[PDB]
Amino acid sequence: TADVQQKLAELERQSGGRLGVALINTADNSQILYRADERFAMCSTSKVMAAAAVLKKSESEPNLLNQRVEIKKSDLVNYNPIAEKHVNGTMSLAELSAAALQYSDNVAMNKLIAHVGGPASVTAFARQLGDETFRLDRTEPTLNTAIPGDPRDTTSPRAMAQTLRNLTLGKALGDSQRAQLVTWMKGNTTGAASIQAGLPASWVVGDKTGSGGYGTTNDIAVIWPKDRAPLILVTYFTQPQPKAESRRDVLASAAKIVTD
């Protein structure tokens, strides 16, 4: 375990940025932590908590996921690959959740945040799960500014890994809702170059990526290797320069270091 820490510190030094890692290995409950109690801007990885809040709401409101939401041209923001195909049409809350999680559609995320009552309502759902660190302050895309020292829209790798474990494997959601969140994350289309690129190809992975200002490049994942116990992995990364380019390769390298 002294070797894995040295490897992460060296990966961080070579990258020029700030790396946050939290690995929970459910096989023995061991953890690998690197800046796991420091805050980082979640960017689009916050979409997991917004979809989960709607899933929690659906437990006491039958057929909530079938409720329809109109998409208007005025709702469109910087990245809406699914919503832009439904302008003057409607999408169900299930379709918005799938679009937010699988394509990282920002309009879909804003509909989810709005549905639960706004950013503070998403934060309140996090508190109800025992997550005292997560905070959602803004909507998409301003929640992705990732200004160094700004606590808005941040969490810690430790907090997010524990929450992701509670959501996907634990009892934070009702059985059906947990299975639905797992199905949505397994269907993600945006993660091939991030955590997944550091893992054996055959491993079943559910993840949610994100990126923002200051070259912020993130990924959160539940990993299920065949015939093994699952792992929960959060890899957050940020850089000194406001217009730095993304570093998905750093997340892949970190995933390989902590899983070898």
Ligand SMILES: *C(=O)N1C[C@H](NOS(=O)(=O)O)CC[C@H]1C(=O)NNC(C)=O
């Ligand atoms: C979330 O981080 N988003 C939305 C989208 N996510 O895709 S990723 O998960 O593959 O990264 C694109 C990046 C980010 C976003 O909106 N970035 N741009 C701005 C202006 O914030």
